[PDB]
Amino acid sequence: LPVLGYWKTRALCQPIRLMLGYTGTEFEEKNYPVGDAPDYDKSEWLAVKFKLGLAFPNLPYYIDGDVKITQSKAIMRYLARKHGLCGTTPEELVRTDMIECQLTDMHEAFFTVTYEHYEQKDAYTASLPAKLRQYSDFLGSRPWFAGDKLTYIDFLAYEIFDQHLSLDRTCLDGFKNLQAFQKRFEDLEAIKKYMASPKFLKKPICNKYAQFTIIEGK
Amino acid sequence: MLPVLGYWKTRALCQPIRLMLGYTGTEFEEKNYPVGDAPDYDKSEWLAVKFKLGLAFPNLPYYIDGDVKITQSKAIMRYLARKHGLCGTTPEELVRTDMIECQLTDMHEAFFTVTYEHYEQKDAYTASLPAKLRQYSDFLGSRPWFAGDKLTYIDFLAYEIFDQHLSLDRTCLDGFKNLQAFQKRFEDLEAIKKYMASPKFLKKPICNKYAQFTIIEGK
Numbered sequence: 519l520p521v522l523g524y525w526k527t528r529a530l531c532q533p534i535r536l537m538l539g540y541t542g543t544e545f546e547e548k549n550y551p552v553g554d555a556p557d558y559d560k561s562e563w564l565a566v567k568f569k570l571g572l573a574f575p576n577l578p579y580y581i582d583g584d585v586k587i588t589q590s591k592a593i594m595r596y597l598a599r600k601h602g603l604c605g606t607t608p609e610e611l612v613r614t615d616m617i618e619c620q621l622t623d624m625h626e627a628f629f630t631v632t633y634e635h636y637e638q639k640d641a642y643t644a645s646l647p648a649k650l651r652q653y654s655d656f657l658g659s660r661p662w663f664a665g666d667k668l669t670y671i672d673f674l675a676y677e678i679f680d681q682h683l684s685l686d687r688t689c690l691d692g693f694k695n696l697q698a699f700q701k702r703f704e705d706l707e708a709i710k711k712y713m714a715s716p717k718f719l720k721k722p723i724c725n726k727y728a729q730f731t732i733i734e735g736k
Numbered sequence: 737m738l739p740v741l742g743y744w745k746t747r748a749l750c751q752p753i754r755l756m757l758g759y760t761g762t763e764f765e766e767k768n769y770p771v772g773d774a775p776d777y778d779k780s781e782w783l784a785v786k787f788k789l790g791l792a793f794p795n796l797p798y799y800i801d802g803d804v805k806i807t808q809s810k811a812i813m814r815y816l817a818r819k820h821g822l823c824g825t826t827p828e829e830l831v832r833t834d835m836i837e838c839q840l841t842d843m844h845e846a847f848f849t850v851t852y853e854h855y856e857q858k859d860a861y862t863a864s865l866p867a868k869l870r871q872y873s874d875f876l877g878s879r880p881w882f883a884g885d886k887l888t889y890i891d892f893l894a895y896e897i898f899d900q901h902l903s904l905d906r907t908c909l910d911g912f913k914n915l916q917a918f919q920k921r922f923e924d925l926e927a928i929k930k931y932m933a934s935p936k937f938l939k940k941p942i943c944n945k946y947a948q949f950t951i952i953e954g955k
């Protein structure tokens with residue numbers, strides 16, 4: 519059976535958990551503790567990090583038979599290929615590639631603010647309307663970002679949007695179609711059942727040493 | 737009508753795309769935007785057209801090809817890679833190219849950080865390289881290309897990142913003979929070689945005008 523290793527956080531692992539839940543893929547989650555401040559010790563992870571067979575040790579990792587993967591996007595694409603969640607046509611694939619990279623940039627910008635520079639918060643929330651407009655416009659009246667077909671990048675998008683809503687609950691207010699997107703994803707029957715299940719991880723979004731985690735406790 | 741690659745007059749993250757287009761012989765206008773002098777480093781021109789190109793996520797680089805309009809460097813690379821037979825085929829090749837694309841992307845950001853804003857930490861950065869390059873060395877092994885027997889778009893990424901890193905520290909590949917062999921193999925392909933002897937080929941600047949590494953080295 520497959521093993522998913524990560525912190526006990528959402529961060530950039532959640533879109534993977536969401537894919538696994540949507541597909542009814544049984545998996546084993548391996549977490550690693552982070553100690554209390556100020557050292558935030560990670561000895562357990564460090565004790566095994568180079569002993570797992572991974573070409574480039576990191577979190578999250580995915581161990582599936584003799585398939586051993588790091589890089590969260592490499593893992594989403596891997597699962598995508600096994601469960602019909604890749605783009606199909608050339609027009610679909612340029613949409614999914616582009617937005618995968620754009621969401622990655624956004625998620626990094628979110629991490630920058632939420633971990634070490636949470637004093638830049640009101641500036642970060644001020645730049646979101648312009649960013650979200652670009653997604654709003656890109657999605658248009660499509661049910662999913664690639665068009666008619668649900669793809670792995672909808673999982674990434676939903677989760678990043680949802681995390682930003684935790685940071686700023688009004689950030690989707692000006693964009694009806696983006697609000698309709700979150701609801702569409704949440705209403706997928708397999709998503710709705712996963713999110714009601716015992717393994718669903720609601721908190722925390724970031725790790726314990728992120729300022730966002732320390733101040734808001736989400 | 738036929739394709740426009742838009743970027744600064746630098747190598748940075750757009751050169752691996754230039755290396756792909758060159759290898760495939762595809763004709764493209766490269767459209768450039770200027771950057772003003774210190775202290776302003778003006779970008780009025782680019783900023784004047786940036787939102788008027790019909791790009792979904794306006795940015796540099798971009799690639800315009802008929803009604804196809806693309807931003808995100810890796811997205812452009814993957815698009816060229818599907819077009820020209822430079823994707824992996826095997827399940828094992830695809831999991832290898834995905835991982836290394838993403839790994840090189842991280843590595844490249846770490847390099848940009850040090851060369852643009854934190855060039856004071858350069859000795860610490862160079863000292864960090866061996867452990868990272870060791871990972872790339874072992875990953876590659878005796879294969880001629882990172883995906884296996886087959887040349888893919890992520891060799892175009894790996895060669896340029898390693899070459900930029902050689903411009904930073906001439907000694908960085910020294911303990912890794914397969915990696916050094918890789919730079920020359922890529923350099924030895926005939927589409928590559930002629931592209932490099934072409935006048936349009938960019939050797940410098942690696943980074944933009946306002947990078948500390950550029951101000952100091954002038955490469």
Ligand SMILES: N[C@@H](CCC(=O)N[C@@H](CS)C(=O)NCC(=O)O)C(=O)O
Nearest residue numbers: 529530576577578588589590591842
């Ligand atoms: N580009 C990587 C970033 C992975 C990453 O930064 N993981 C963090 C947690 S979000 C980490 O703890 N990395 C290093 C480590 O665990 O040793 C990916 O997408 O997977």
Ligand SMILES: N[C@@H](CCC(=O)N[C@@H](CS)C(=O)NCC(=O)O)C(=O)O
Nearest residue numbers: 623748749795796797807808809810
């Ligand atoms: N993740 C993006 C990064 C794009 C990017 O950072 N572009 C820089 C130059 S390296 C830029 O000047 N963009 C133009 C802008 O901000 O308007 C990619 O891989 O293309």
